[PDB]
Write a protein that binds this DNA or RNA. Structure first.
Ligand SMILES: [Mg+2]
Ligand SMILES: [Mg+2]
Ligand SMILES: [Mg+2]
Ligand SMILES: [Mg+2]
Ligand SMILES: [Mg+2]
Ligand SMILES: [Mg+2]
Ligand SMILES: [Mg+2]
Ligand SMILES: [Mg+2]
Ligand SMILES: [Mg+2]
Ligand SMILES: [Mg+2]
Ligand SMILES: [Mg+2]
Ligand SMILES: [Mg+2]
Ligand SMILES: [Mg+2]
Ligand SMILES: [Mg+2]
Ligand SMILES: [Mg+2]
Ligand SMILES: [Mg+2]
Ligand SMILES: [Mg+2]
Ligand SMILES: [Mg+2]
Ligand SMILES: [Mg+2]
Ligand SMILES: [Mg+2]
Ligand SMILES: [Mg+2]
Ligand SMILES: [Mg+2]
Ligand SMILES: [Mg+2]
Ligand SMILES: [Mg+2]
Ligand SMILES: [Mg+2]
Ligand SMILES: [Mg+2]
Ligand SMILES: [Mg+2]
Lengths: 153, 207, 257
RNA sequence: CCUGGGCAGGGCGAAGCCAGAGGAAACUCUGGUGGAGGUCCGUAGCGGUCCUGACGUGCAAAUCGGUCGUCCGACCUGGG
RNA sequence: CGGAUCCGUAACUUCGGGAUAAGGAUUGGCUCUAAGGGCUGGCAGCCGACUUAGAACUGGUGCGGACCAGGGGAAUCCGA
RNA sequence: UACCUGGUUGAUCCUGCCAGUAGCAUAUGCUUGUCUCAAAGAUUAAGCCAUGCAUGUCUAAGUACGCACGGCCGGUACAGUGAAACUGCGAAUGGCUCAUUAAAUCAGUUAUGGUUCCUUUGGUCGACUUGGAUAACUGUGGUAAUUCUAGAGCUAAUACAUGCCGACGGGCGCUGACCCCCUUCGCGGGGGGGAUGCGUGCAUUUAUCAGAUCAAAACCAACCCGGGCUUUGGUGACUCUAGAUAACCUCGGGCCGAUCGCACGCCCCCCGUGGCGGCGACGACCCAUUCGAACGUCUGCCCUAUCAACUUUCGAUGGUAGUCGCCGUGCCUACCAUGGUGACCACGGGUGACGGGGAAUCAGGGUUCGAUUCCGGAGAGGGAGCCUGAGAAACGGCUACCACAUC
RNA sequence: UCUCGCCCGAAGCGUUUACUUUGAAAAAAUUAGAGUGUUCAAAGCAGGCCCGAGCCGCCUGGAUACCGCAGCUAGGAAUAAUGGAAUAGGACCGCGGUUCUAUUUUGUUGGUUUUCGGAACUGAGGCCAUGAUUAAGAGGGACGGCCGGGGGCAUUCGUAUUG
């Protein structure tokens, strides 16, 4: 849905569908892009309703360069979340390691539904989408725990 | 004077970043030409790489494309409604890349005639003008050729354009940058987006 | 800085020009040309340093502008026109003719091949495209742009090019079992048969090579120049097949004297 | 002492409450709601500081004009 | 100086204040724009309150236009 | 060189420091015969400068009526050396210093699919010569003077401009008067052909269409043979390159040669008043390419908690369009959401901190410097703005203020 | 898996890193270090032979190593974390039924209906030795017999002191 001033990606909407005059399906004009790299396009990009300027599977955002991994911290920001990459920095003097981390804010495509805090996620380098975001959510790996559990109500 | 440098900003965190340049040459920011709707006036600007770039102070004509039937005609710009990014520029009558323009319906009337006879939008007058419509009389198989164009494909414009053409105006979205390329190019609204923007304009007349 | 540079320091010169320390502060910066400065070879260094044709630098400027030196069949007026890998250097008034290949150590050498091979030049395909009205175009690492080449030329292939008419003749493709020569990296001047290439989607593919007596190296695609068709060199090659010997084998050769 | 009467608007924003964020706990932080005070500017009212102003055989055997203190109170006030 | 709005507010302290501290800016006329609601129907149609924010134009720098209306700071003595 | 010695006590043992020891690099004393290399106003003052120099430039191949020089040279303009001036290109590299600057520059890693690029090297490059204007020069002046210029007259071109021929018409694009056969009484239907007219090339900006991975039938409506046929490229990926169609093409107006030298011979013909012109120098739209440049991704930095919360009306993080820019982006505007970082050291101070490659110091591990010859950044007294140019916020370029300071 | 050209080429192709051994990759100068009589040496990158000038000449070098950390590539699976199947919403083979489209072939164009190829949805089974490492002289908790000037509240007693 569009609840803003306009959203319409590239594909020409009006194929003069009154050739007999009929209701019909109208989800047919959807742009569909493979990123390649052996990473499967999810089917939410196939049968979605959303129009996103910055989605890697709908927009013109190419994917190149580096492929990193992190874990989801927060989701408060609109269509973009904040991941955290831990690692081990070496010191030559003491000859053992220490932990460090640098929080990366990454653009989250809305096709990746149910993306609960704590999962290992994979990101790819892009062009600068915004001021602090330079990566894009490539593939969500885990649900971080058990999907199967259910509680009362 | 205006520089659009990113280094006078704060950081990722928000600490103040110390300046160490002096707003160098390759980050020029030039003042914006608010493109009016008057008779044609375009200045040039020398740009890095020697490429000539055009400021348009006011434009009148523009290149616009009908959607479905694929027509493209040089047409005058009349009125500007619903910029949808800043409502100041509506009253200012400024043309930008995404802006919605009323367009004289006349240079599509003669095309729709000349390819698509028994045209539309003639105020139901029926004695008015010499419309070389029926005079040519269409002797050979060209009549059946135009009849398959006109009634088998049925040439209908999905209401929304009937009511615009009997009032003689047309809604089109700009699709080029008048401050950059000096041309007010654009495409005519059709169907879904047309009734969407018409709903927004009726809401503007409401509140 | 402001715009492009216009000098080059003698210490900042690349290693393979065999330049000296106590001589001067300035290296010859080669002109902008069809070869990069990290891989090129200046004409003033070629005539002055290695061949011992001219003692000073100015004598090279005198002879080249008195038209004695031609490159690829035609005279270059410059004293610092950059050369490249696999270029024809012909000299007119003295019967002499030169070819630029790599030594086993990594350097340019002298290779006095005949006019029969002056006619024939190899080159590597950089990329391929189409232009106006649907016509093809091939781009060379020697910055030759040539239209209507062939339909059966892969991107990383080798074209034998003629310097008479400038039109291609007798291409050779890229395939497992072809003899290639290394033009870059730490293993340049190595000549061997392509064994196995690995293709990555990370924009940098690797190639393993073996040669005679079975020694195997590995490198990247832009460092590779296909030189033969199934262990048969198109072009004569200096010092055997140009195999790198060993440190110990170099020592034993110089002890054998 | 008894019985009745009277006091425009506003500024400050406690207890109690709500929501959100943090914390392991103790609890903390932020935004509201809330309307306490012998509480702050100020009306009527009550007093009378200064001008040592006007008057000073006056309007008058203690008044007038500006300038003032206090106004939910230990407040002001009639009758018995 | 004085109303209001928007900024900003020290020393000291019983931590409640000081505090409208000190110091600034803005304030007109006229065109709009945006937001803040009620009643009806199986998300849509009719009917209305006086407030706030922003923009342009413009007047001889002029805007609390009269009336209305806190000079302020630094200290000392005494008395809560 | 994997190294110790004296010193508290009346005497011993011990923790502990003090002082002796050896380098290095700044200064200084005394002294000093040769020879080879060899740092040097960095430390305090990135304080002030007298003077003189440090960026200019010509080929047979842009512009020669100079007064200079004289070829043989008579006249059909011009040969030649050529001062001076116009044009073009370069003065944005180099050289100096380290005051600012603590994920900022930097070093490694990578990519521009999100960009620009003078030059070089390729590819593309399908009217017997038109127009004014100016400098050098000539005279003529001004002011105490500067690389000061006014006015009067002259002329140039690859300065500026204007602008044509060829060339066949092609076939497609849409129109289009018209034509051949069948059916039908005609009407009409069906099948197959065609005078004119408007456009056209590549760049510019929109819009739309076409766009590839595999292989057998049952029918019916039409009809081709002797039951049986028709097909741009690449990456990992595109909105890439390329086609096809509708139009635009901006008076501050993209391209499509009114340039120049050498060699002189050959052809037809009717005179050459026509061709055949081989060889070169220049530039011009774009595509490459080379030199880079700029912003990007990841990782790494000294001391400090007597700096623990910071950021957000005048952007703090993001979403949506857009302006601006070479392009991507809170780079800027408007609207909307309320975000972002931090005890794994945020934010804030200090540095007698420019960063590295490196230097000194010898068991091994380190510690202390790196002003400085190479890479990169910054600034020309502070600090702000800007023209030209492919390339500058240039300072041996310009504009104003401040602080000096000359005549 | 034999789709692609009995087997390999090729391809699925990784739960995922830390760790190693490769291999690239990088810039010189410096350091280590090879060669070389700068008269030695610090240096420098040169030089060395025959030829009585006559060969209008020959041979050879200007090495290699080191380049923290971070990133790339392929072997190794011990060490140290992580993955799976417990309310089955497992694993694998073979069916039903629904629903959706892709290009070949019916000489050729089009339409109607398929076989089919792929995704998905749904239901019914059979099949797995069908699925949970044992209980730390780690720990927590239950338990039950006592234990203690342990803690708090309340109560009672005792002399003595002082009056
Ligand atoms: Mg209205
Ligand atoms: Mg410099
Ligand atoms: Mg009070
Ligand atoms: Mg008060
Ligand atoms: Mg008062
Ligand atoms: Mg009162
Ligand atoms: Mg009174
Ligand atoms: Mg009184
Ligand atoms: Mg009184
Ligand atoms: Mg008195
Ligand atoms: Mg009196
Ligand atoms: Mg009071
Ligand atoms: Mg006070
Ligand atoms: Mg008071
Ligand atoms: Mg006192
Ligand atoms: Mg008192
Ligand atoms: Mg000592
Ligand atoms: Mg100075
Ligand atoms: Mg850079
Ligand atoms: Mg930079
Ligand atoms: Mg804003
Ligand atoms: Mg400093
Ligand atoms: Mg040492
Ligand atoms: Mg050491
Ligand atoms: Mg430097
Ligand atoms: Mg500078
Ligand atoms: Mg300079």
């Amino acid at each position: 849905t569009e609840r803003a001033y306009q959203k319409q990606p590239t594909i020409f909407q009006n194929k003069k569908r009154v050739l007999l005059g009929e209701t019909g399906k109208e989800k047919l004009p959807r742009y569909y892009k493979n990123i390649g790299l052996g990473f499967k396009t999810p089917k939410e990009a196939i049968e979605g309703t959303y129009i996103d300027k910055k989605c890697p599977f709908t927009g013109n955002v190419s994917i190149r360069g580096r492929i990193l991994s992190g874990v989801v911290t927060k989701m408060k920001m609109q269509r973009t979340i904040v991941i955290r990459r831990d690692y081990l920095h070496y010191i030559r003097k003491y000859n053992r390691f220490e932990k460090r981390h640098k929080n990366m804010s990454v653009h989250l495509s809305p096709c990746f539904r149910d993306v609960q805090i704590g999962d290992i996620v994979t990101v790819g380098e892009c062009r600068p989408l915004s001021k602090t975001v330079r990566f894009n959510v490539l593939k969500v790996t885990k649900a971080a725990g058990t999907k199967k559990q259910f509680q009362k109500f | 004077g205006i520089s659009r440098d990113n280094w006078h900003k704060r950081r990722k965190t928000g600490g103040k970043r110390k300046p160490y340049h002096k707003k160098r040459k390759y980050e020029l920011g030039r003042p914006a030409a608010n493109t009016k709707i008057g008779p044609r006036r375009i200045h040039t600007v020398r740009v890095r790489g020697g490429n000539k770039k055009y400021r348009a102070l006011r434009l009148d004509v523009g290149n616009f494309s009908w959607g479905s039937e694929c027509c493209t005609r040089k047409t005058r710009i009349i009125d500007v409604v619903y910029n949808a990014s800043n409502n100041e520029l509506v009253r200012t009558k400024t043309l930008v890349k995404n802006c919605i323009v009323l367009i004289d319906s006349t240079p599509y009337r003669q095309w729709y005639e000349s390819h698509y006879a028994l045209p539309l939008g003639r105020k139901k007058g029926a004695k008015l003008t010499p419309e070389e419509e029926e005079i040519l009389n269409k002797k050979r198989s060209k009549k059946i050729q135009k009849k398959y164009d006109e009634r088998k494909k049925n040439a209908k414009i999905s209401s929304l354009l009937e009511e615009q053409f009997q009032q003689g105006k047309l809604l089109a979205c700009i699709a080029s940058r008048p401050g950059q390329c000096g041309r007010a190019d654009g495409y005519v609204l059709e169907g879904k987006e047309l009734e969407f923007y018409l709903r927004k304009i009726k809401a503007r007349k409401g509140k | 800085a402001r715009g492009p540079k216009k000098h080059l320091k003698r210490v900042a010169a690349p290693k393979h020009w065999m330049l000296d320390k106590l001589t001067g502060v300035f290296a010859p910066r080669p002109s902008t040309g069809p070869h990069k400065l990290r891989e090129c070879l200046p004409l003033i260094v070629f005539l002055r340093n290695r061949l011992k044709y001219a003692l000073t630098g100015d004598e090279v400027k005198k002879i080249c502008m008195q038209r004695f030196i031609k490159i690829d069949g035609k005279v270059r007026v410059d004293v610092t026109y950059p050369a490249g890998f696999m270029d024809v250097i012909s000299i007119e008034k003295t019967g002499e003719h030169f070819r630029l290949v790599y030594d086993t150590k990594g350097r340019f050498a002298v290779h006095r091949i005949t006019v029969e091979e002056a006619k024939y030049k190899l080159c590597k395909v950089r990329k391929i495209t189409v232009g106006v009205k649907g016509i093809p175009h091939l781009v060379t690492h020697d910055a030759r742009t040539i239209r209507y080449p062939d339909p059966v030329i892969k991107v990383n292939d080798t074209v034998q090019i003629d310097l008479g008419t400038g039109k291609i003749i007798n291409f050779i493709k890229f395939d497992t079992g072809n003899l290639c020569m290394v033009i870059g990296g730490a293993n340049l001047g190595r000549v061997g048969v392509i064994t196995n290439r690995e293709r990555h989607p990370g924009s940098f593919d690797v190639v393993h090579v073996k040669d005679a007596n079975g020694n195997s190296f590995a490198t990247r695609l832009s460092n590779i120049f296909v030189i033969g068709n199934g262990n048969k060199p198109w072009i004569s090659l200096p010092r055997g097949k140009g195999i790198r010997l060993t440190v110990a084998e170099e020592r034993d050769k110089r002890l054998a004297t």
